[model samples]
Target: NYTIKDITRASGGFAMLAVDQREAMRLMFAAAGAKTPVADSVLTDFKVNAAKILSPYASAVLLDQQFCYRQAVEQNAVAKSCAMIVAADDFIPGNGIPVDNVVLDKKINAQAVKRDGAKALKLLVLWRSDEDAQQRLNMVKEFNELCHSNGLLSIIEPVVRPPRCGDKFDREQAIIDAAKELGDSGADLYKVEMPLYGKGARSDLLTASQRLNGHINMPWVILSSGVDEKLFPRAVRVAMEAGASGFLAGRAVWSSVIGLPDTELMLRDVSAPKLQRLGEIVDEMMAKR
Candidate 1:
């Protein structure tokens, strides 16, 4: 059976790449004043090149089927040194939100992806205050079974959101709550959001990370969505200190290069170095353990 070690660095820490964005990426391009109507090809090219150029430094790379899974595979985009993780979650947009709801995409042939050299699969579970907790757990259970039966490691990303019916949202508490609910749900890896967005005082962030860590029953890593780019490296260090394995992130490493005139150069010159450093941080932290 595939284990988490297959996708993590030799130091037993994870520094994974995420290029699974779909409409969210289109929005990012549009927000960056990229040419209107960012084509699918635009996103595909970027994702493929990101894996091709950046995967050498990452322990693993996550790709979505809608954008670049097959393309990356056929083009031999990912480095042989890195493991490939395929996104198995399907997103539904509502109320102008790109991922209002998420479900396991039944169309993803797990055996095929594994045959294509994928070591694992990732699912995004949206934890909302209004949704049925059992429903979420059931989905994760099924997802875990799917991966296990296929000899692939299962990774779950449980991100929190406010109640759909009400405006009240405690983002931090919800983050911890999500972990409490799904941390030990049989997935090999848990990807979580940073507490305090990795911007608070060191003492405060460390406390918050420790609190979050206490609830997780499995190895977990921080994602880079809400945290600032400059602050992310420190966030990784703090999180590792608080028991996080490392990071499986995208924005902090590559978002700044978006819509730039030369994407290849930016990925090579800028993002690659950032990814390398982040990987180094993971190894450095894991060494202490």
Candidate 2:
């Protein structure tokens, strides 16, 4: 027997637009991959027209991976609405530091997943020092297992560092190794750092993406370090061209606005019109093919 449940909702239908503004703000912060307490008023104001501005074309909402589930539950923002939760801390090594930190991070992430009913999670694994790679891989395996046991999904970011003054091979190999480990671990997504300069940088990045794509089920997301406004647009275009699903930005967006002296005061003064402009910029950049 034919049933209405078999029908897919239209792109502009109410079911598709059921997102809450508060939830949208949470997701945007998650997608941006930032790790700080966002101003409540700032999020509130953004939520008012969030759906009106972003709902029609948007398919998913991204949220902070580092969010503590207990805190989110206290704030009443993690249930029945949020799409994906992300964790964005760079894990360090040691007893009081590395191991303990990873444990704490895992606890928070697991709690968030449990509280959010095991929706999905994006784990940002950092590969800064030489020891970082193995440590990150171990963490990914642990977290992936934890999430899987709890019926949640997990993504891992491979190590993608900048090239030394003239060492292109070293840089490319670092990315390759990282991607290999992430692919082998079965991450749901790979957040990779973008190569900013050097000959054939874009080609190299694309190659790395193709290799990882061939080996893994998750999509790749580009994370750039520079602070140029132009970088954002170009990065988005390149990522899409390489067949990435979307991106996760950090430092690039909030550093300029939130790093100023009296930043909190400035955030308070940010007008609706200005926030609308910022939203417009995000929309335009994300909309690029």
Candidate 3:
């Protein structure tokens, strides 16, 4: 039977990589000074290259349908030693921002993903106060069933955001609240944003992670979205120490290589080492357990 261990290291820790981003990746490329109209091929090439060059150090790699899944599957871009995850979340753009609403993607074929050698499926849940809580719960319920029916692991990522119209907002509490709502919602794994964005005094970060951990019933890991790259390793260490299993992340490991010349070399030299170190950290912490 497929289990969480299928997507984790021998030490039973997850050190996954994510390239599932769509619009956000485009924005990152633009931020890196790439041409305004970054071609689809550009993003695909980077995704495929990063998968090819860096997956060797990752336990599993997450790919999205709108970007590189087909090409990577056809080309065997990912390392054979690593497992694969297909992103099944659809992002709705709104209010001059991408991913305003997150939903289960209808376009993704779970059977096809399983056939293409994927071991897991991921859903992105945008936790907002204004949205109906029951709707979100049902979405996750359906998503979990979808993955289970396909014999694939289900990973849910709940990212907290302020209400579209509310003035009161506390980011950390929102994150904790998200976990309280969905952490044990039958998904095999939970991917979380780091507390304090992985900054602040070391003790404070650990305490916050512990507080967040109290609400999460399943194994959890940190995402690297808003955390600075330099601080991500420490963030991983702190989170793991406070009960996180490891991390399933993207930007902190590979974003720096975007728009750089010699893409393949940069991925191999720069991003590969970063990924390797993250994997080491994960394994070490898992060993301690």
Candidate 4:
């Protein structure tokens, strides 16, 4: 009975707040003017507060085992009513722009995550041509089996990364190819990086999203990493208009608040409104379709 609709039910349709930032968060803190080597406690505080304040407006908060799991759960920061997704991939940060590789985090396993309270488990496949395609496919199969065997929703994010051969790689094709490879590889929900980074005119973005849509076999949602926050609402709207069920994004809503004064105030007052607006966009998307 636990299915993607469970996510929709928890979210009041199809929108989620992804707070699962790990190593990437430290850099964002530095980028946002906070000190590097940001304390684990600080990151936990941010995610915990984020869940507490935003849970009602979102279907669930996607949390990571590294920084978000313990404190948020023990403190009861998330709503009992919303679904909870725990990240299964342990990211290897390359130069810090894109993740190098994704492997199962040592601390996470399907039964343990479900026992800990996650309704779903997510893993990332860093799509790179230089890597073994077969290995990636096999990994996806194993992760999905693990989740399904334990009755946890399997959410897979196939983040296309430029090969070590460098940036000259065909990224748009990579996005499409990644989807083709993992789209039906067995995840219950596909969390995709927006094709073309949600750039260009609306027509182009929509067309690109539509192209990517054909490859994915299950309910899919776009992430908000590379897209500008200002444009994310439109991105989600157009994507859902095409075929996306909703969005599971983090930066577009809270990245700007990283080093600002009154972090809690910004999360409650500033970030909450942004989430509401995104929800409104989700609702409006429905009304049109």
Candidate 3 residue-wise lDDT, 1-289, digit = tens: 4799899998999999999999999998999999989899889999999899988999999999898999999988999889999999999999888989998999888898898999999999999877788898999999999999989999999998889887888998889889989988999999999999999899999999999999999999999999999999999999999999999989999999888899999989998888899999998898887
Which candidate model has the greater lDDT, 1 or 4?
A: 1
Shift of residue 258 alpha carbon in model 3, Å:
1.1
lDDT minimum window of 10 residues, candidate 4: 5-14
Task: Rank candidates by lDDT, best first.
Answer: 1, 3, 4, 2
Evaluate residue 245 in candidate 4 and report its C-alpha lDDT on the 0 to 100 scale.
Answer: 83
Candidate 2 lDDT tens digits, 100-219: 233315345465445654344556554433445567667787777766666665656554544323444466556656666666676555666664421245676556556645655455
lDDT for residue 53 in candidate 1, whole number 0-100: 91
lDDT of 1: 0.94
Best by lDDT: 1
Tens digit per residue, CA lDDT, model 4, 46-114: 898889888878877899878888788899898876689998887876675536677877668677778
What does candidate 1's lDDT look like per residue over 1-289, in tens digits?
A: 8888899898999999999999999999999998887899999999998999999999999999999999999999999989999999999999879999999999999999999999999999999988899999999999999999999999999999889898989999899889889999999999999999999799999999999999999999999999998899999999999999999999998999889989999999999988899999999999898
Model 3, stretches more than 4 Å misplaced? none
TM-score of structure candidate 1: 0.99
Q: Each candidate's TM vs. the true structure? A: 0.99, 0.55, 0.98, 0.94
Worst 10 residues of 1 by lDDT: 1-10
Candidate 3, poorest ten consecutive residues by summed lDDT: 127-136
User: In angstroms, how far off is 108's CA in candidate 2?
Assistant: 3.0
**Which is better, 3 or 4, measured by TM-score?**
3
RMSD of 2: 9.1
Q: After superposition, how far is residue 92 of candidate 1 from its true place, in Å?
A: 0.1
